[PDB]
Swiss-Prot record, chain A:
Organism: Homo sapiens
Full protein stretch here: 25 to 54 of 110
Protein name: Insulin B chain
Amino acid sequence: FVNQHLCXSDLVEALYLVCGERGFFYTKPT
Amino acid sequence: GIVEQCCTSICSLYQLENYCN
């Protein structure tokens, strides 16, 4: 719907509305 | 990392769903 940068509250925005209110976890490998 | 092309450059929404769990 945009095909742009997906980072912070942006990549988060999606993740939140994308995931499905089931929490998530980006990179931060331990 | 998982949020590669996303947090760095362009990305895809379906990719965001993958992170979910």
